[PDB]
Structure formats: structure tokens, C-alpha cells
Amino acid sequence: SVQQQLEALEKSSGGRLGVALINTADNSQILYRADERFAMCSTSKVMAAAAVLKQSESDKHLLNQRVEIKKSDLVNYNPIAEKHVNGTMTLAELGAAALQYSDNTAMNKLIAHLGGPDKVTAFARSLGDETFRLDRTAPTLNTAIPGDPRDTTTPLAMAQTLKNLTLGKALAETQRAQLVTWLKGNTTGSASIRAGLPKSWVVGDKTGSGDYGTTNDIAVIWPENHAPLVLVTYFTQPEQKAENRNDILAAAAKIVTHGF
């Protein structure tokens, strides 16, 4: 019935829905188009921040390293970085801004620090993720053109990697905890996966939206009396100027976390 419910949701939606839920109680999964590629949009910011966290494991000064913010670094959506023009932000602060506010300047500074989008890909590969690819900086990583492989992954690959990052083997403990803290403090996800869940469940997530009405969210969810769930909900539409549809992500989240 869960499969039927997701099929029905997609049927009405006017787009293409991708879901992967991993239930860490038993490693079971709920999958819907989970091996199809979707543009990640800002969900990719998790991988860039995590790559810097990985580096910080072997450089105790890295997270407090100053990064100069200049007016020319501002792009299309940078609510935190714009406050710091002519000043500095630390790499930790850039991670926080990228994840909790989806700050594009912050994402770009993380990418630049790492040595370019391909370094983020290499980090994902180092985690066993064969699917993730980062090709561009922000905001062009949000073009989300149907069939374009740039800046894409699959729901299952991203769920597996988010699990490894937040609950599993990817990062040292202090860094894992930092990533979790960041995701829990996200400000941009109220109407997405979170809106489909019991209000008191603890959740960390990263949203992403782009053209083609591409509307995404990746989450780690801690029920009150059950093992964590890792959930990726990706959604994209056929027309370039389609509205984004966080409601669909909330609906999908409700479907797959029910009976629980």
C-alpha cells in the first residue's frame, strides 16, 4: 500500500517523485524511483560541508580558519554572507550558513576551499558513494534541467550517504556530531519533510530547490521510541518555471513514516 500511495501521489503531482527511506531498526527500505537521477540543488551543500569536516579531522585549526567575504562573492541568495562583507567568517561559520540558511556564498567558499566541485565529488566517492557528482558552484548547480547529469545523485545513494554521514562511519565523532547539530538547526525546512512528521520528532534536514520546480529535502529523523529513519524526498517537474512543491515532500514523508 505504501508503494500504491506513493504512485498515486506522483500521479497527481505533475512531476517525478523520488523517495528513499532507510529504517535503521532493521536496515529495511522504502524506495520509489530511488535509482533515478535528480538534480540535488542545495541538498549538495551537505556534501561540501561534510568534506570540510573531514579535512578538519586532521587539522585542528581548520574550522576556525578565517575566510574573507567580499562584495564580489555575493551571488543570488546569501542571507548570512551578506552580513559579513568586508569582514571574515570562519570555515565552521560557512558550514553553518550553508546548511542552516542555504547560503550560496557560503557553499561557494566551502567549494573553493576544497579546490573545486570535483573535490566534493571525490569526497563523496571516498564514502563509497558512486553516484553523487558536483559539477558547478552556486547558483548554477540549481538549473536542474531534465536529463542533465550535472550536480545529480539518486535518492538511494543520497540516503545511504546521509546515513553514513550522520549516523555511521563517514566522519569522526566530533565532526559527525557537528554535522548533526547543523542539520538539526536548519531553518529552511519547516514546510518540507518536517511538515509530514509528528511535530515532536527530532529532525535534521537540508532542503534544495531549483528550476524545473525541483524541490528536494534530505533528512535524518529520530522518533521518540524507535531507531532513526533517513529519508530523501526529491521532486522535479517538466517545465522550467514550474513552482516548487514542498507540499509533495511533506506528503511523501507522511506516507512513508506512517505506522510508526
Swiss-Prot record:
It comes from the Bacteria. It holds the Pfam family Beta-lactamase2. Transmembrane segments: none annotated. One of its GO terms (biological process) is beta-lactam antibiotic catabolic process. Substrate binds at residues 206-208. GO terms for molecular function: beta-lactamase activity. Keywords: Antibiotic resistance, Hydrolase, Plasmid, Signal. It is an enzyme of class 3 (hydrolase). Its EC number is 3.5.2.6. Monomer. Belongs to the class-A beta-lactamase family. Has strong cefotaxime-hydrolyzing activity. This is Beta-lactamase Toho-1. It comes from Escherichia coli.
